[PDB]
Subunit: 327 residues, 4 copies
């Protein structure tokens, strides 16, 4: 009733968007596509290890399930012919990370696709409250960027706008994700590092986030970095070390600039929080003023922002979805 | 060893498959000539070389044309979902170590035989009318004419030598088991759909106590016929990457027992498969051990009720303990 | 009567009882004792790894800290006999340090000027051990020291009671698979009680452990005294625990559903029921003292007998704490 | 030439130093001081969660303490200076309690009649700070109190030395992703040493934390004094850590392989080199003080000043311990 959504892939992101959508007025879910029975889908929506119990009546039917009395239709699998009989699709499989690949939901019936991942090809990449006003309403396929990109973009925008961003290096200390292995095991993408026991290791990994030029064109090329995946099930931290144009910067100046640009996607804190404190939060990024460092030898600037790589990213995606569907 | 050798093929190069491979390198004599799994050589070689719980493989692993070389010996590798296309006939495989978890059935494992392997040893409990073997409890029920054989489970290997002693020395009336078990690779990293419809095993493995069914106690009569139907129980999966505990609480015929008699009777049954300790150890102290079961004398108590009951507990490395037992049974079984 | 509560030892139970007492009209925490500064106390009340952010204003004022405008006095006095409890008109101390778990020893608080002590753990001596909604009406209000029992005892008692009342309990064996606690060690190190197993890295081991919950169940349910035994394994989850109980019942041909139904039918503010296949993290933050899991019910033959296994989840933190504050309020009301 | 050692504080570092010393010819332990009984000490030397079983006979036979037949004396004396050092046959006391991390404070061991103290931690006052194979040749044998630096400093120093010697170091930022340690708490709970972040459940959080390693690097490598800064994130692995370093260098046109090759060319027993894509648990038990990981080198170039990123692994237990025992042996040749 206002904005109708199909979710393809009822994984961590798919389920959290479902929950998120239940708290956002004007947005509904009408269909869910995944390869598993309804009972399993209902069960995994109801119970969440990190995010807690879904408050709300879930009960299973044949062609889907009921949530608070609203039926949701359930389907199965990828490409070839499943929506002929939606306002926007949330692509969540992690297997349409490409433009012509995600050109399949279009053929299938739905107006717009919001891809819950970075994607290749000729599409806009959107971080909400950094560059959503770039959306004009004619797009068929849109990337919602990554979790790390949504943590980094508002921070990078301020640094550039206020002090001039010359260059920067990032490290993200990142919760382990579902595409990592439980035990040491062959990995599908040939990543020898993600093949390892997720909850027992510090695992170095690549990330595309630092592709920031797709969200903030004016700093394209200026950033790089990577990830270290560690044994927390959700909640992550992005450290950013930069050279700035404006050479006489102080800790409080950077902190004040961050505070001044806060909004519902970009929070600010001066408390001495740890990763589990950000679990379930709805800012896409939470700037941590306690971690700001300026390094002078006659400057390098370091900053850190927290994000729940689940709910932070999800909240941002549902915001982009809503803005995409008021189109 | 060449044409000489007892040729082992490993199907499924997971935790059990790689550990079996390591054991076989150690033991020597028999040769892993082929490995099948659906991934490239570089991944296989890397995962053999580095191991989160079990430590660095000592010895040279290098990626060559047909597969990989371990300490100069070429191992052939294949990427094949259907095991009946496997070139077992061409390589004259003697035993396929079936470790994929997808062929845990007498009939199903026959695919390997069609492909040309003489014998299959399944690294898990299996249905139907096959022999289920715990080394040093019942490996001698084998005669060398079997084509498909089960190596039982990790839990069953921890339990059987304990149960045997209780029955032989005191008479087992009835008993309850709980195994607090390390999480396994078929469990999910994050909350997601499980491959076999299991809602519990569907949950984040490293963040939950997860109730789980095990056949170990009910199917103990496959290994120890004289106590068929006398045990039951289940499992809880918990956030340790390996290392497991079996608790067993039993009623004995002798109603005049002591902690000392029980511990003494366990002690005097020790072998390579059944260890004994008197130290208050924890799960991480059994990582990498090659006993199939380690009896922990510090946990024995004699309780009364209304009725004398006896509680005992045995540690196992559900990985290396099981694997050591499997390779013992494999060595015994290439034959006749 | 807004009854005045002092909390001694502002650890996991301490802080959680504080959060619960916010939702109880006519209980107000006026003092907190722990050996640390105000800033640390206020921070740890605000942020909680497993239980989530405290909603409401916490601010460090000069003499202690303010929660939603109400001042809470703080002290860091290691010797409980020295606390200014007379001076502050304390009715009841929630004794949560783990160092006064004895009737005579908890008397120190009475010495200090407090009227009653409720100990957040099993205790020895001449006092009552109370599991709310199983035996709290043993309290007549003349008690000066009371034990709130254990987390495990609270999970087990309503289950045991139903088995006994409806089927007759002959004997029973319990295992609790238990979250690791604060008195456990981060790394291998010496342990206060001399426990060589609690000495070990808590988040890296299955750790066998003694519990009195099954043996001392006769303190809470006299009619089954001596009928249960069992132990615990501490495992690497930060909170959320399970109690398995296997028993012999004085009733023939009992089905899984018949046991399940009798549990459901006894359900109240302390005893919940579920028919979903949940896991430990699903009970984090729940306020039932025990949650019966109908999906883990089995009826097995072991040799000419039927053994019935049941399982009950508890959040060894919030479940216990909810039970404790119920008992605290009941005691206050009398 | 058979160096005799007293270990004060039989914690992680103390026990590992004990073990390490059993593999090093010419060095032996004669006394251990900690506040706990022999049985607990023997038990914790025998079994180790991360480092594995101690091979070798440990017995509390006869209410004493024996390792492979050699008796080790144990004391339970919290008053360092009340220790029997002026009796007893010592060459060096290893101070591992974390409570004497100051030149004057560590003098208690000397007043007790001791001769030399080696502190297993950073320390204040007028003493030399030593990272073996970076600045040990600064030791002349006349020092009474010496600091063995930190785990992080030992991982960082050989990396920083090569960057400076070969490329010129202008400035640099460090982050160490660090295993949690035993002074961290198991459950959110007040920390005595009131760190609001180390107060939090160690195995369930990413915990930001200060380290002196970058700022105090000038104590080990004087020519780069003031050129480095950074901090730590404590994460849920029980041991094994990583140090990332991002630097501006003097030699502007540097490449990944050049930095890598320079690192390789400086390797020795304290400083290792790897080109495999390993993870933390692969360094558990290793005896290099620092292991350079060539797979993680990054050069960032936009036509300003180049940023170079490098990472070195360390087992914050055994790496540090191996370095400490090398410094112990060396101090004891001079």
């Amino acid at each position: 009733m206002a904005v109708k959504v199909a979710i393809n892939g009822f994984g961590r992101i798919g389920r959290l968007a479902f929950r998120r959508i239940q708290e956002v007025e004007g947005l509904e879910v009408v269909a869910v596509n995944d390869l598993t029975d309804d009972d399993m889908l209902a069960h995994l929506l109801k119970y969440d290890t990190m995010q807690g119990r879904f408050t709300g009546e879930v009960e299973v039917v044949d062609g889907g399930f009921r949530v608070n009395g609203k039926e949701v239709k359930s389907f199965s699998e990828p490409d070839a012919s499943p929506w002929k009989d939606i306002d926007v699709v949330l692509e969540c499989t992690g297997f349409y990370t490409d433009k012509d690949k995600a050109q399949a939901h279009i053929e299938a019936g739905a107006k717009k696709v919001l891809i819950s991942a970075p994607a290749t090809g000729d599409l806009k990449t959107i971080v909400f409250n950094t560059n959503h006003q770039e959306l004009d309403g004619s797009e068929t396929v849109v990337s919602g960027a990554s979790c790390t990109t949504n943590s980094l973009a508002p921070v990078a925008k301020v640094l550039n706008d206020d002090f001039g961003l010359v260059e920067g290096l990032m490290t993200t200390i990142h919760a382990y994700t579902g595409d990592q292995n439980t035990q040491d095991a062959p990995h599908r993408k040939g990543d020898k590092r993600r093949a390892r026991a997720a909850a027992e290791n510090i695992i170095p990994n690549s990330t595309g986030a630092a592709a920031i030029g797709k969200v903030i064109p004016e700093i394209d090329g200026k950033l790089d970095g990577g990830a270290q995946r560690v044994p927390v099930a959700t909640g992550s931290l992005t450290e950013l070390t930069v050279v700035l144009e404006k050479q006489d910067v102080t800790v409080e100046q950077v902190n004040e600039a961050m505070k001044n640009a806060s909004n519902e996607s970009f929070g600010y804190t001066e408390d001495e929080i740890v990763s589990s404190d950000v679990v379930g939060m709805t800012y896409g990024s939470l700037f941590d003023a306690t971690q700001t460092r300026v390094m002078s030898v006659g400057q390098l600037v370091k900053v850190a922002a927290w994000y729940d790589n689940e709910m932070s990213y999800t909240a941002q995606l549902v915001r982009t979805l809503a803005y995409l569907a008021e189109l």
